[PDB]
Amino acid sequence: PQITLWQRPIVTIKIGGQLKEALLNTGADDTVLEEVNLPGRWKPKLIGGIGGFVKVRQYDQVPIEICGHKTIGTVLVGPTPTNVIGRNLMTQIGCTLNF
Amino acid sequence: PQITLWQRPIVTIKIGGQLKEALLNTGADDTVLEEVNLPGRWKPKLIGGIGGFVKVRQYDQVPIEICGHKVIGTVLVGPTPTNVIGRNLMTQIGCTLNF
Protein backbone atom coordinates (compact mmCIF):
# COMPACT_ATOMS: atom_id res chain seq x y z
CA PRO A 1 1.93 -3.12 -0.96
CA GLN A 2 0.00 0.00 0.00
CA ILE A 3 1.60 3.22 -1.16
CA THR A 4 0.49 6.50 0.40
CA LEU A 5 0.82 9.69 -1.62
CA TRP A 6 2.62 12.18 0.66
CA GLN A 7 5.72 11.60 -1.45
CA ARG A 8 6.03 10.90 -5.20
CA PRO A 9 5.33 7.18 -5.71
CA ILE A 10 8.70 6.20 -7.13
CA VAL A 11 9.39 2.47 -7.25
CA THR A 12 12.20 0.20 -8.42
CA ILE A 13 11.64 -1.69 -11.63
CA LYS A 14 13.71 -4.40 -13.31
CA ILE A 15 13.85 -4.15 -17.10
CA GLY A 16 16.24 -4.92 -20.00
CA GLY A 17 18.63 -6.45 -17.46
CA GLN A 18 18.83 -3.19 -15.44
CA LEU A 19 17.40 -1.80 -12.18
CA LYS A 20 15.70 1.57 -12.73
CA GLU A 21 13.47 3.95 -10.73
CA ALA A 22 10.11 5.04 -12.10
CA LEU A 23 7.02 6.96 -11.03
CA LEU A 24 3.67 5.17 -10.68
CA ASN A 25 1.66 7.68 -12.66
CA THR A 26 -2.15 7.25 -12.87
CA GLY A 27 -2.24 10.38 -15.06
CA ALA A 28 -0.23 8.57 -17.76
CA ASP A 29 -1.82 6.17 -20.26
CA ASP A 30 1.51 4.64 -21.25
CA THR A 31 4.84 3.61 -19.76
CA VAL A 32 7.86 5.62 -20.97
CA LEU A 33 11.45 4.86 -19.97
CA GLU A 34 14.78 6.55 -20.82
CA GLU A 35 18.07 4.72 -21.54
CA VAL A 36 16.99 1.11 -21.60
CA ASN A 37 18.21 -1.09 -24.45
CA LEU A 38 15.48 -3.58 -25.33
CA PRO A 39 15.93 -6.41 -27.87
CA GLY A 40 13.96 -7.20 -30.98
CA ARG A 41 11.42 -5.43 -33.11
CA TRP A 42 9.68 -2.14 -32.37
CA LYS A 43 7.54 0.41 -34.15
CA PRO A 44 7.65 4.19 -33.86
CA LYS A 45 4.91 5.85 -31.82
CA LEU A 46 4.13 9.56 -31.54
CA ILE A 47 3.35 10.64 -27.99
CA GLY A 48 2.70 13.94 -26.19
CA GLY A 49 1.42 16.34 -28.83
CA ILE A 50 1.06 19.70 -27.13
CA GLY A 51 3.47 21.90 -29.09
CA GLY A 52 4.49 18.95 -31.27
CA PHE A 53 4.75 15.21 -30.81
CA VAL A 54 7.71 13.20 -29.55
CA LYS A 55 8.72 10.07 -31.45
CA VAL A 56 9.52 7.02 -29.31
CA ARG A 57 10.03 3.32 -29.96
CA GLN A 58 7.16 1.09 -28.94
CA TYR A 59 8.17 -2.37 -27.67
CA ASP A 60 5.41 -4.89 -27.06
CA GLN A 61 5.06 -7.66 -24.52
CA VAL A 62 8.15 -6.60 -22.56
CA PRO A 63 8.85 -8.58 -19.37
CA ILE A 64 9.27 -6.08 -16.56
CA GLU A 65 9.34 -6.48 -12.77
CA ILE A 66 7.72 -3.69 -10.72
CA CYS A 67 8.05 -4.10 -6.93
CA GLY A 68 8.74 -7.78 -7.56
CA HIS A 69 5.60 -8.31 -9.60
CA LYS A 70 6.74 -9.86 -12.90
CA THR A 71 4.34 -8.71 -15.61
CA ILE A 72 4.30 -8.21 -19.40
CA GLY A 73 3.37 -5.04 -21.22
CA THR A 74 4.14 -2.33 -23.74
CA VAL A 75 7.12 -0.11 -22.94
CA LEU A 76 7.81 3.08 -24.87
CA VAL A 77 11.52 3.87 -24.95
CA GLY A 78 12.59 7.46 -25.47
CA PRO A 79 13.23 10.85 -23.88
CA THR A 80 11.12 11.56 -20.89
CA PRO A 81 11.71 14.14 -18.20
CA THR A 82 11.22 11.28 -15.65
CA ASN A 83 10.67 7.46 -16.03
CA VAL A 84 6.98 6.78 -15.89
CA ILE A 85 4.93 3.59 -15.18
CA GLY A 86 1.55 4.38 -16.74
CA ARG A 87 -1.84 2.75 -16.40
CA ASN A 88 -1.01 0.09 -19.00
CA LEU A 89 1.40 -1.59 -16.56
CA MET A 90 -0.48 -0.70 -13.39
CA THR A 91 -3.41 -2.81 -14.58
CA GLN A 92 -1.02 -5.73 -15.13
CA ILE A 93 0.24 -5.60 -11.54
CA GLY A 94 -3.38 -5.21 -10.34
CA CYS A 95 -2.69 -1.74 -8.92
CA THR A 96 -5.79 0.23 -7.87
CA LEU A 97 -6.62 3.58 -6.30
CA ASN A 98 -8.41 3.12 -2.95
CA PHE A 99 -10.10 5.50 -0.47
CA PRO B 1 -14.19 3.22 -3.65
CA GLN B 2 -11.67 1.03 -5.44
CA ILE B 3 -10.80 2.47 -8.83
CA THR B 4 -9.14 0.17 -11.36
CA LEU B 5 -6.91 1.73 -14.01
CA TRP B 6 -8.10 0.30 -17.34
CA GLN B 7 -9.61 3.69 -18.05
CA ARG B 8 -8.46 7.17 -16.97
CA PRO B 9 -9.51 7.72 -13.33
CA ILE B 10 -11.77 10.69 -13.89
CA VAL B 11 -14.03 11.57 -10.98
CA THR B 12 -16.64 14.17 -10.13
CA ILE B 13 -15.59 16.93 -7.80
CA LYS B 14 -17.63 19.69 -6.20
CA ILE B 15 -15.83 23.02 -5.86
CA GLY B 16 -16.62 26.76 -5.95
CA GLY B 17 -20.33 25.91 -6.15
CA GLN B 18 -19.77 23.87 -9.35
CA LEU B 19 -19.69 20.20 -10.34
CA LYS B 20 -16.54 19.46 -12.36
CA GLU B 21 -14.68 16.38 -13.67
CA ALA B 22 -11.02 15.82 -12.82
CA LEU B 23 -8.33 13.19 -13.22
CA LEU B 24 -6.91 11.46 -10.13
CA ASN B 25 -3.23 11.94 -11.04
CA THR B 26 -0.53 10.33 -8.84
CA GLY B 27 2.09 11.84 -11.20
CA ALA B 28 1.00 15.39 -10.21
CA ASP B 29 2.19 17.04 -6.99
CA ASP B 30 -0.55 19.66 -7.09
CA THR B 31 -4.19 20.10 -8.00
CA VAL B 32 -4.89 22.39 -10.98
CA LEU B 33 -8.37 23.32 -12.19
CA GLU B 34 -9.63 25.47 -15.10
CA GLU B 35 -12.63 27.86 -15.04
CA VAL B 36 -13.57 27.88 -11.37
CA ASN B 37 -14.19 31.11 -9.50
CA LEU B 38 -12.86 30.90 -5.95
CA PRO B 39 -13.39 33.66 -3.37
CA GLY B 40 -10.84 35.48 -1.27
CA ARG B 41 -7.11 35.94 -1.36
CA TRP B 42 -4.56 34.07 -3.48
CA LYS B 43 -0.92 34.33 -4.41
CA PRO B 44 0.64 33.61 -7.77
CA LYS B 45 2.53 30.37 -8.25
CA LEU B 46 4.74 29.30 -11.15
CA ILE B 47 4.14 25.72 -12.25
CA GLY B 48 5.43 23.46 -15.04
CA GLY B 49 8.79 24.81 -16.12
CA ILE B 50 9.84 22.79 -19.14
CA GLY B 51 9.97 25.41 -21.92
CA GLY B 52 8.85 28.12 -19.52
CA PHE B 53 6.65 28.31 -16.44
CA VAL B 54 2.90 28.88 -16.26
CA LYS B 55 1.57 31.36 -13.74
CA VAL B 56 -1.51 30.28 -11.81
CA ARG B 57 -3.35 31.51 -8.71
CA GLN B 58 -2.81 29.49 -5.56
CA TYR B 59 -5.79 29.31 -3.20
CA ASP B 60 -5.27 27.71 0.17
CA GLN B 61 -7.52 25.65 2.39
CA VAL B 62 -10.22 25.34 -0.27
CA PRO B 63 -13.22 23.18 0.62
CA ILE B 64 -13.64 20.60 -2.13
CA GLU B 65 -15.70 17.40 -2.35
CA ILE B 66 -13.99 14.63 -4.28
CA CYS B 67 -16.08 11.64 -5.04
CA GLY B 68 -18.21 12.17 -1.90
CA HIS B 69 -15.35 13.02 0.48
CA LYS B 70 -15.34 16.61 1.81
CA VAL B 71 -11.76 17.74 2.34
CA ILE B 72 -9.67 20.93 2.50
CA GLY B 73 -6.63 21.67 0.39
CA THR B 74 -4.63 23.93 -1.93
CA VAL B 75 -6.16 24.42 -5.37
CA LEU B 76 -4.24 26.04 -8.20
CA VAL B 77 -6.54 27.81 -10.64
CA GLY B 78 -5.40 28.31 -14.18
CA PRO B 79 -5.06 26.88 -17.66
CA THR B 80 -4.53 23.18 -17.70
CA PRO B 81 -5.05 20.79 -20.60
CA THR B 82 -7.24 18.72 -18.24
CA ASN B 83 -8.41 19.25 -14.60
CA VAL B 84 -6.08 17.39 -12.30
CA ILE B 85 -6.42 16.20 -8.68
CA GLY B 86 -2.82 15.82 -7.53
CA ARG B 87 -1.26 14.11 -4.58
CA ASN B 88 -1.93 17.04 -2.26
CA LEU B 89 -5.68 16.29 -2.33
CA MET B 90 -5.35 12.53 -2.66
CA THR B 91 -3.63 12.42 0.74
CA GLN B 92 -6.55 14.37 2.25
CA ILE B 93 -9.11 11.86 0.99
CA GLY B 94 -6.82 9.03 2.21
CA CYS B 95 -6.32 7.68 -1.32
CA THR B 96 -3.55 5.06 -1.75
CA LEU B 97 -2.09 2.90 -4.51
CA ASN B 98 -2.52 -0.81 -3.72
CA PHE B 99 -1.36 -4.05 -5.38
Partner: peptide, 7 residues
Protein backbone atom coordinates in the same frame (compact mmCIF):
# COMPACT_ATOMS: atom_id res chain seq x y z
CA UNK C 1 -2.11 11.86 -22.29
CA UNK C 2 0.54 10.17 -20.20
CA UNK C 3 0.69 13.04 -17.56
CA UNK C 4 3.08 14.44 -14.88
CA UNK C 5 3.19 17.64 -12.74
CA UNK C 6 6.52 18.33 -11.03
CA UNK C 7 6.00 20.85 -8.20
Amino acid sequence: KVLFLDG
